Amino acid sequence: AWKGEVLANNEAGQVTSIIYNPGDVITIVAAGWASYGPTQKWGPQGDREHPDQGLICHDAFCGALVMKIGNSGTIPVNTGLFRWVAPNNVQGAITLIYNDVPGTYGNNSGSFSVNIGKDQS
Amino acid sequence: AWKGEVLANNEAGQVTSIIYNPGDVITIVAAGWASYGPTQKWGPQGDREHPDQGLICHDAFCGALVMKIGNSGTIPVNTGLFRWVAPNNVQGAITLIYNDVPGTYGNNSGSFSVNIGKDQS
Ligand SMILES: [Ca+2]
Ligand SMILES: [Ca+2]
């Protein structure tokens, strides 16, 4: 299991100790407050009122928590995943990333606290 | 395990099928959008900018997801709990509740989708 902070301004993302392997079932819970620029802050689902202006994940709002597994594209995490299994052929290290537009992470702030565990399978 | 919706206007709370027993470890993941009255909506952590005007749970923001276990007082849930154990002497059915001021639930809208499972222990 892994617990750590994911900084909103960390464009490369936060690498975890979790290596997702075929057949694995995992659970993620994410909490906290972060911003993609404004003085306001949002939770791990991001800002539902803000337009997508080139986000690294088009399937979640700006400011949402997303992830990559090995060399996958971005996958929405939001507040978390419950006893979740990955798509076929998706495997490898889990990296957590704040959803923002490439090159615009410098004015971000805050972070999410995240737990990941592997479940019975 | 249990999956269901918790309506923001449900003042009595949503009873789940989970009976928390001594020693149990549980995980909860909550997602979605709801409001305590304004046109805007907030996620399961509620509205960090809104003052507490008599919330059923003073340890969470207005519009946050909270719970009671048996005859316990309210306990924050927010986006979820990861492999969590209850305080001593807390046991019974888990009821999930939107955090608002008593008697002011009538103008609430939206809901959270919540999963609860018991973990290995
Ligand atoms: Ca930004
Ligand atoms: Ca209300």
Residue numbers in the entry:
A (entry chain A), B (entry chain B): 1 to 121
Paper text:
In the structure of the GalBG0–LecA complex, solely the galactosyl group and the thioethyl part of its linker are well-resolved. Interestingly, the linker moiety points perpendicularly away from the protein surface in GalBG0, thus indicating impaired surface contacts of its tripeptide moiety with LecA. The presence of the aromatic β-phenyl aglycone in the GalA series caused an additional affinity increase, as indicated by the ratios KdGalBG0/KdGalAG0=12, KdGalBG1/KdGalAG1=4, KdGalBG2/KdGalAG2=4 (MIC values: MICGalBG0/MICGalAG0=32, MICGalBG1/MICGalAG1=21, MICGalBG2/MICGalAG2=160).
In the case of the opportunistic pathogen Pseudomonas aeruginosa, which causes lethal airway infections in cystic fibrosis and immunocompromised patients, the formation of biofilms plays an important role in antibiotic resistance and disease progression. Biofilm formation is mediated in part by the galactose-specific lectin LecA (PA-IL) and the fucose-specific lectin LecB (PA-IIL), as evidenced by studies with deletion mutants and the partial inhibitory effect of simple fucose and galactose derivatives in vitro and in vivo.[5a, 6] Understanding the glycoconjugate–lectin interaction is a key feature in developing potent biofilm inhibitors. Herein we report the first case of P. aeruginosa biofilm inhibition with a multivalent ligand targeting the galactose-specific lectin LecA, using the related β-phenylgalactosyl peptide dendrimer GalAG2.
